[model samples]
Target chain A: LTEEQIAEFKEAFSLFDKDGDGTITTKELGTVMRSLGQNPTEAELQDMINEVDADGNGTIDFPEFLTMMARKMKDTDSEEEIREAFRVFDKDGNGYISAAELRHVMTNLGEVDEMIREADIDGDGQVNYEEFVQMMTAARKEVIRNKIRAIGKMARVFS
Target chain B: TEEQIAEFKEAFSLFDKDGDGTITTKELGTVMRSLGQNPTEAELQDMINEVDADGNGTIDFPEFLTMMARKMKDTDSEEEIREAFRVFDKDGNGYISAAELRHVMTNLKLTDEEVDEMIREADIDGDGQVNYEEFVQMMTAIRNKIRAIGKMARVF
Candidate 1:
């Protein structure tokens, strides 16, 4: 799995491991499925957990959660999915995400100009597909690193 | 999910020190040595060979990502741990001494007291130094705790 995919699965697993204990209980799995618009009976949920709960603990750990995800979510971000994201930013339907386009869609700090300057490798004042993908992958990595670093720092203080 | 790819990017950039967007066997070998691995030239070639799609004789970002995903499906191996240990054992000593630990820890902005405490905890037998076993146990617990932290972080 791509790192991003695994990171996402990790988040999902954490959300399911709601009690913060390190494993996903049958009740937790039941909550997840029900929230997802499924109507699995308690028995059904227990059976599902049993299949992937490798140690017969009746609860799923991260590895077991990954096993279940491998069975369910088989695809990763594809080229088409990426292009679709680009389209959202390129509201003008032009070939690029211009500063003007960014102004309309984004409201965070630095609101508009910084992104184009950072991603537009050719200094074209706009973000094309290649530039957008590069920015996305780079930004995602930065976010993850910062997140992990924050966790590490918090751990250091407590430990 | 993509966090793994982010980590792969960090590792890839570390190997691609020249910032040329790809990694040659020579670069890989050099970085491996820097990290305390001692693969021979042939070994480096064979390492790149499997992932060098298009037979380019070098690894681009995508190929590097694929290789990392395959190799890191599980937690790091013992050799990987040893490589890290070697980084701290810079003087080629059999263990990490307090001075070495303090030197490295201070570089990261940790207080001397914290470093001493770290040693106090990890030096299992209270030998005032951390041997390989102690280092491994320390790392194992850290990684395990990180797993807990990661799960909790998402909730935030």
Candidate 2:
């Protein structure tokens, strides 16, 4: 994100960091929205926290707030913009996200699971760049193509 | 230091539109507009002048690094405040004159009257300009005031 965008977010975070500790707790979350006169319900506030908290850790850091308010997220489709989206699933930063990593929330986790089950093709138990991209961005099950192409015809015949 | 340079190079690579290897004022204007900021011509000019060190009217990678590096600081810290004063001092002259202050404040779009009030707050020596010592004291003092006022998160 650009400096101006970050500055705007820092100001926003500081507003929420009313106690000056530089983070927004679940308790601080609702009041700031209320101060802006939004009157969000407790559950709605919980959702807001869940959506932006990013690490699923229940506290919002400045970087998390930066992603939530970043102009890139609103404007561009680059990885720079999708970073927060990526971080939600890639919580461990292992450069590979296991099915379990995404299983908790996607309800459609096994939705991506079928594609991955195939892409693990050689039994390395992994998803390649292509299938993972389809999993997150496309969300189209036709990547069942992953299952079909998992192994070549000869391998499918033996199994 | 080399890794720092490389990291900033990567960020500038992302920022320099058109892959031209330099970031122009027009490109910057595009980003600001993309962010829904409507900077006036004067503000844009002043913003570029702060980092366009080669007088090329656009920022090269090194210049971009100079600008971005200054920002990775806590405004209330003395070492950081000292480093920032050096950045604005530019000439290593140990003073930031009215013109320099005015130039920098343009991006904030402060009215002349408002900028005048800020200079007044920061110019402790009555020299019609701010010296290094004056700048540090002023920034630290203002930071405390902001915390006390419970408003004005603009100190950074």
Candidate 3:
């Protein structure tokens, strides 16, 4: 997720719980998720309740709900392994990675192997930093050509 | 040595052959082949998925550089890559000694018995220290193991 989106989520959640009760009802949660374009079904809401209602009170407290969402965001296959992978990918001794370097590495990998082409969504000559993240998500999802559009609306709120 | 640096440069260049200031999937394979290393289809895909920023097929120079840098900074430079290599090259002889090999294996949690077995299997000359070829072989094996583990973790 972009930095801005992260900030926006935090802000929106803080504002939604107007009473500062440190908890949100199902209706409140549904409204927030819908705003983010993820409208949960009744079944989904129930699942969320089951997952987040740590006290089993049939209601989710804010702390528990926030914890659940945070965990979902951090759900990499293995944090350590992904960190190591990031290092190998970042050749330039820089703390952050740029898009140009990513494109160069991806192109060569695609040519020799058949599977690489399947992940290359746009068939573009280059994969930018943003595209690279989408590629990872798509791969994790195991579906072909799933266009993950960046939700820019959340940026301002997040930022 | 300069030759080694040259080799690395050549590999990097091949990956960046498009002169577009970045490397794509095709370029990466080209470099890998030059190094006599052929990645499997799944392996290549995994690499792309790991680093492709825009869901595009190619990695630009910046992306490629970043991946390498990240690897060096986090994994190799910290504990395993550079230090492990240094430890293996014991005797201050710029080569691997049995003691050094055993030390690393032990640190990695291999039992003493396992270490003895590996020494018997790998130290064919019984010189009590591995030669350059042996050293290279051991390093490659370790690298492969780490890479496989990485892929598995990412897939999950």
| Candidate 1, residue A35: how far the Cα is off, in Å | 39
Evaluate residue A135 in candidate 3 and report its C-alpha lDDT on the 0 to 100 scale.
Answer: 53
lDDT of 3 at B99: 61
* Higher-TM-score candidate of 2 and 3: 2
Q: What is each candidate's DockQ, to 2 decimals?
A: 0.01, 0.02, 0.03
Query: What tens digits encode model 3's per-residue C-alpha lDDT throughout A1-159?
Result: 687545544543453453457776677666544432345787887777788788888767756756665665456323433333334344564644445444444453332133334435566543334444555554534422221111111111111
The true-versus-predicted C-alpha distance at residue A57 of model 2, in Å, is: 24
What lDDT tens digits, residue by residue, belong to model 1 across residues A39-95? 788888888788788788888888998887666532222333355556645766778
lDDT (Cα, 0-100) at B49 in candidate 2: 93
Poorest stretch of ten by lDDT in candidate 1 chain A: A150-159
Off by over 4 Å in 2: A1-159, B2-6, B72-139, B142-156
Tens-place lDDT per residue, model 2, A5-123, is: 45545655766776888777777767654433346787876776677776788877887766655533333323322333334445466755567655532332122455447545445
Q: Write the per-residue lDDT of candidate 3 for residues B4-114, one digit (tens) a residue.
A: 444334334545665566666666666555333567767666666777787777676556555655654454223333333444564567656556666644432566566
Winning candidate number (lDDT): 1
- Model 2: number of backbone collisions: 0
Give the chain A TM-score for each candidate.
Answer: 0.44, 0.41, 0.41
